[PDB]
Structure 1
Amino acid sequence: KAKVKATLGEFDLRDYRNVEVLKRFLSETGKILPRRRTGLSAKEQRILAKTIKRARILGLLPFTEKLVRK
C-alpha cells in the first residue's frame, strides 16, 4: 500500500476542522484506519482518534459509508 502519514507535510492532528487532511484517515466505509495503514505512532493515533470523533459530532466527517461494488 502507501502510508497516510507519508502523503503529508506538517499537520496539526489536534485540528478537528481540517476535513481535507482528517478525511484521508478514514476508510471508504468511513471508519478510522488502523495504524498498519495510517503509519502513525501509538501516541499520535490516540490523538487522531480523539480529533476525528469530534469532527464527526460536528457533522464534518462521516460515521459510516456504504461500500461501493460488493
Structure 2
Amino acid sequence: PSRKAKVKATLGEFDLRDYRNVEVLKRFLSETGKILPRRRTGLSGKEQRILAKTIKRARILGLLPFTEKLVRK
C-alpha cells in the first residue's frame, strides 16, 4: 500500500540543498538511518537525487546517522 502520507506532503517550504536542517532531513530517513525511497518520500527524480546528496553531506558533519538499530524483529 504505502499511504501513511508522503514525507514531502507534510513538510512545507524547505531547501533541499540545506545539509544542516537536521529537523527536516530527519523526516526522510527510515526507522533506520536509511534514506527513504521515492515511493515514500514522494519527491521527484530530480529532487530525490538532490536530497540524497544533502542527506549524505549531513552524515559527514555528524548531523545525520549512517545507520540505526531496528527495535523489534
TM-score (structure 2 length as normaliser)? 0.93
- In structure 1, the partner of 2:7 is 4
Q: RMSD across aligned C-alpha pairs, in angstroms?
A: 0.5
Show CA shifts across 1:1-54 (max 9, x none): 210000011100100000000010000111000000000000000100000000
* CA distance, structure 2, for counterparts of residue 28 and residue 15 of structure 1: 22
Structure 1 runs of 4+ aligned residues shifted over 3 Å read none
Gaps of 5+ in 2: none
Gaps of 5+ in 1: none
Q: How many residues align?
A: 70
Please point out which of 47, 57, 65 is paired with 2:50: 47
Q: Give 1 or 2: higher helix fraction.
A: 2
Please point out which of 2, 15, 19 is paired with 1:16: 19
